[PDB]
Amino acid sequence: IKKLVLKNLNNSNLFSPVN
Amino acid sequence: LGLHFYKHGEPEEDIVGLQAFQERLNSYKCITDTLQELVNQSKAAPQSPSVPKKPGPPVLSSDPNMLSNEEAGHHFEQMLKLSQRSKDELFSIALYNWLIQVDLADKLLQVASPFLEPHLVRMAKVDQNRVRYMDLLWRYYEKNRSFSNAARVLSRLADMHSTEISLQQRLEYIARAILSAKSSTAISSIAADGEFLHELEEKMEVARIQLQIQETLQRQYSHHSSVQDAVSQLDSELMDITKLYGEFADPFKLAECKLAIIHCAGYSDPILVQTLWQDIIEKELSDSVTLSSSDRMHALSLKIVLLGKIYAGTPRFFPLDFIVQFLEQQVCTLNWDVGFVIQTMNEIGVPLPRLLEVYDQLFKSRDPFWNRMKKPLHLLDCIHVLLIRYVENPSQVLNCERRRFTNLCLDAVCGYLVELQSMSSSVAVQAITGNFKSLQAKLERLH
Amino acid sequence: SQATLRTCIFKHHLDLGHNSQAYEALTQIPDSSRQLDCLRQLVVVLCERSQLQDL
Amino acid sequence: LAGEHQQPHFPGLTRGLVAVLLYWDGKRCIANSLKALIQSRRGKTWTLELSPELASMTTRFTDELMEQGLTYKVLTLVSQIDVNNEFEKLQRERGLGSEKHRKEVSDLIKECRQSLAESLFAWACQSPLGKEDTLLLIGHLERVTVEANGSLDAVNLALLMALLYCFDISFIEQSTEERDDMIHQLPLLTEKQYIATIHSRLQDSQLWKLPGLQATVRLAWALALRGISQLPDVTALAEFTEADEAMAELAIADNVFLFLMESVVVSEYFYQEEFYIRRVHNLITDFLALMPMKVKQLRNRADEDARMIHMSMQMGNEPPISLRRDLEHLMLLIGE
Numbered sequence: 001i002k003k004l005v006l007k008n009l010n011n012s013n014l015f016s017p018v019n
Numbered sequence: 020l021g022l023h024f025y026k027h028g029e030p031e032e033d034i035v036g037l038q039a040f041q042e043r044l045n046s047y048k049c050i051t052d053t054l055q056e057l058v059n060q061s062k063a064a065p066q067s068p069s070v071p072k073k074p075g076p077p078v079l080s081s082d083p084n085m086l087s088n089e090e091a092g093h094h095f096e097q098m099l100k101l102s103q104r105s106k107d108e109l110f111s112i113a114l115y116n117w118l119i120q121v122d123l124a125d126k127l128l129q130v131a132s133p134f135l136e137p138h139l140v141r142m143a144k145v146d147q148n149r150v151r152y153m154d155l156l157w158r159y160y161e162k163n164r165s166f167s168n169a170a171r172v173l174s175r176l177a178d179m180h181s182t183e184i185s186l187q188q189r190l191e192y193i194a195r196a197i198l199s200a201k202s203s204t205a206i207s208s209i210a211a212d213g214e215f216l217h218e219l220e221e222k223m224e225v226a227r228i229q230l231q232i233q234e235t236l237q238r239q240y241s242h243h244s245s246v247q248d249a250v251s252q253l254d255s256e257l258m259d260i261t262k263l264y265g266e267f268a269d270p271f272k273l274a275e276c277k278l279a280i281i282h283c284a285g286y287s288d289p290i291l292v293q294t295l296w297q298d299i300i301e302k303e304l305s306d307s308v309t310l311s312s313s314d315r316m317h318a319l320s321l322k323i324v325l326l327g328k329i330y331a332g333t334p335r336f337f338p339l340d341f342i343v344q345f346l347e348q349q350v351c352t353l354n355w356d357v358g359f360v361i362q363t364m365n366e367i368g369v370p371l372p373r374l375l376e377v378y379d380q381l382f383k384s385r386d387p388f389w390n391r392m393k394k395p396l397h398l399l400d401c402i403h404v405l406l407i408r409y410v411e412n413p414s415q416v417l418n419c420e421r422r423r424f425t426n427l428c429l430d431a432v433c434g435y436l437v438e439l440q441s442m443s444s445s446v447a448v449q450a451i452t453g454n455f456k457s458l459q460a461k462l463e464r465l466h
Numbered sequence: 467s468q469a470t471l472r473t474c475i476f477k478h479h480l481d482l483g484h485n486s487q488a489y490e491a492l493t494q495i496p497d498s499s500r501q502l503d504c505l506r507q508l509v510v511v512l513c514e515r516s517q518l519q520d521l
Numbered sequence: 522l523a524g525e526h527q528q529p530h531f532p533g534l535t536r537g538l539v540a541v542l543l544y545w546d547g548k549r550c551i552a553n554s555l556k557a558l559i560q561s562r563r564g565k566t567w568t569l570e571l572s573p574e575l576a577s578m579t580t581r582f583t584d585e586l587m588e589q590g591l592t593y594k595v596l597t598l599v600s601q602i603d604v605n606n607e608f609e610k611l612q613r614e615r616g617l618g619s620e621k622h623r624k625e626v627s628d629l630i631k632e633c634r635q636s637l638a639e640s641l642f643a644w645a646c647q648s649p650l651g652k653e654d655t656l657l658l659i660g661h662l663e664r665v666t667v668e669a670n671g672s673l674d675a676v677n678l679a680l681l682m683a684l685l686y687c688f689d690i691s692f693i694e695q696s697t698e699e700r701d702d703m704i705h706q707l708p709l710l711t712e713k714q715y716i717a718t719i720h721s722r723l724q725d726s727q728l729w730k731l732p733g734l735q736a737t738v739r740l741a742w743a744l745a746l747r748g749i750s751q752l753p754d755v756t757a758l759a760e761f762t763e764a765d766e767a768m769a770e771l772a773i774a775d776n777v778f779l780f781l782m783e784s785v786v787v788s789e790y791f792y793q794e795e796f797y798i799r800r801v802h803n804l805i806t807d808f809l810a811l812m813p814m815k816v817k818q819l820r821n822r823a824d825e826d827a828r829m830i831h832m833s834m835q836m837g838n839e840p841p842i843s844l845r846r847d848l849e850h851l852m853l854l855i856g857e
Binding site: 001002003004005006007008011012013014015016017018 | 221225248259260261265266267269270280283286
């Protein structure tokens with residue numbers, strides 16, 4: 001899709017293992 | 020019965036059609052496994068001669084019944100060109116499956132048989148490797164010149180499923196869908212194959228941004244675990260710009276990708292667009308600092324010529340007048356060529372009359388920058404190179420507009436000669452007064 | 467500075483159509499070169515507005 | 522079954538004799554369709570007022586036939602199809618009916634040869650033939666022979682005129698506003714290899730079966746080089762244009778003006794095509810305009826051979842058989 005949405009309030013941490 | 024069974028659905032109730040289908044396949048097996056024998060013999064590595072464990076002549080340590088790679092390849096091609104004389108449609112299907120199972124894919128794409136399109140149009144709904152049959156089906160439609168069908172199957176590798184070998188294969192499919200849709204519209208100007216063509220060329224730049232992210236995780240972060248998670252997610256779909264920012268380019272903090280992502284997707288125009296073109300220019304100026312001015316000119320030209328060939332079609336996203344002022348303020352600082360910004364805008368394809376309207380108004384601003392940098396003449400040297408480039412290639416203006424433009428160029432050259440002849444008469448003001456009168460004395464013949 | 471300023475005053479009066487204000491701003495020019503070159507705006511702008519009585 | 526259904530339209534024939542007509546009319550329908558799909562291209566010599574979409578569809582579709590080696594196929598069919606060989610096949614198996622049926626089959630076979638040769642003419646007028654196609658067309662014309670009257674047939678006349686239009690440049694003296702996009706559409710200006718191979722094959726000391734046909738092609742090439750040497754930037758081809766008076770002297774030496782009169786202009790088909798008349802008009806007016814020193818050399822010679830004939834007749838001797846009538850032939854050619 002060519003519409004951006006910022007949503008910093010909920011991100012996966014991409015400097016961590018998964019739970 | 021084995022061909023009836025196949026044509027209705029391969030159904031579990033028809034044990035008799037299933038038995039006939041099996042006993043046809045059992046009979047075809049003596050063909051497949053003999054073609055397999057000849058392909059395994061011709062795919063075999065040639066044996067390096069074992070050092071003779073007694074002195075003498077070389078012993079031919081092969082059975083005289085053995086075939087060479089050339090004989091096995093000849094007999095394979097000759098036996099394939101016996102099988103290709105069959106009438107049997109279920110044998111044709113078995114031979115198609117075997118040609119896929121031995122990766123003889125272009126030799127499947129050498130069987131000019133009416134059973135092949137219906138077979139791929141079964142398998143692309145039924146095998147879990149559904150992808151390989153849409154791949155063979157667009158390659159079949161392209162090779163048979165049905166480019167409108169090839170485009171509408173390459174769509175059905177972006178829009179419907181894939182598996183592939185890396186995200187760089189998606190960029191073959193998109194570039195070849197673009198080629199198929201440009202081939203379709205050049206053959207028949209149906210709006211839908213030119214409407215889907217813009218959707219493909221937008222998908223192409225989102226997929227380039229997805230690759231700039233995926234490789235940059237490999238090039239910067241590949242000693243962390245969830246780069247494997249993220250690179251394989253960036254391999255498995257074609258992502259929207261919300262994912263590519265919020266899930267990938269922000270958590271990995273890829274400013275290089277954040278910048279590219281927000282260069283496209285429906286955002287607020289002048290102020291933010293102008294910042295992104297400064298960030299793109301000052302990054303390619305930063306990271307090229309190791310190279311000479313000629314090479315850095317060429318790198319920044321290639322960047323702004325590439326991105327300009329996208330966004331100059333949509334002038335909200337390409338603020339020409341600001342990009343020209345900022346590139347000339349950089350040339351004026353870095354001591355690059357006066358022909359540079361004129362070359363870059365000409366090689367984008369910016370209309371030369373509108374390109375003159377920019378330098379004309381930038382000069383008439385009388386901006387304190389050119390004065391501060393001790394080059395208060397610079398934009399007149401730009402206007403001279405721009406107008407000499409027009410004069411000695413007049414094809415750069417349309418054959419109707421050119422007589423409106425030779426007025427405007429003489430009117431403006433007279434203006435710049437009034438300005439120059441008010442200045443303190445230094446050797447530069449004398450030389451540029453000579454250059455503009457030499458330009459006048461060519462424009463006076465262009466009319 | 468009198469030659470550059472009066473060339474500007476001539477030009478922008480002529481651009482607006484303040485043609486008599488432009489014409490005295492042109493005759494007040496002390497630089498003889500600009501007094502020929504400003505006429506080469508004036509005669510064109512009067513012809514190509516059909517202002518032929520002014521001309 | 523088509524010959525059985527069409528049998529009532531051919532009263533007194535059998536479905537087999539009608540099937541022989543339908544086979545050659547089926548070929549004729551392809552050849553006339555090909556000719557019309559070429560005549561409806563965009564190009565340099567006429568415009569059938571066709572819509573810009575139709576005229577780009579026909580152009581593209583027929584480019585996609587030229588990529589497939591169209592010229593080679595056409596010249597192969599025009600040299601394999603002969604009325605005598607096909608009449609022998611049909612006569613053995615009794616596929617020749619009445620005098621009308623023999624006329625119908627004789628003419629359907631000629632329409633097949635003719636619309637095939639005219640397909641290369643209609644191509645060459647609108648867009649010149651490629652390097653190897655032009656060498657194939659030369660490689661056919663090398664092998665031609667005249668009819669029992671001294672003329673070319675309509676088929677090798679059309680193939681000569683196709684080669685003469687591949688060597689037309691005269692429109693560059695006439696158009697001023699489309700001129701540069703018409704210049705990019707010339708292998709004569711863009712391909713230094715096109716000139717290098719064609720010039721060599723015409724400079725060859727190999728006599729063709731018809732030396733006057735070779736002479737006609739040598740004259741057209743000499744005048745093409747003489748147009749090219751008056752275009753401003755063409756410094757890259759000077760090593761071929763310095764041969765212009767030499768290729769013209771060879772064409773005059775091979776009796777070009779006599780062959781243009783007796784083998785070309787005398788053919789009843791030369792006066793059935795406006796674009797043949799226009800091209801032979803240019804081939805003479807461009808010789809008179811672009812080579813006026815050759816025209817003067819021809820006069821000085823004719824004024825000397827006239828003195829030789831006057832002196833032989835005053836001595837009571839016959840005029841020497843080895844005198845060169847080059848100007849008498851040119852003036853009779855203009856007259857005819």
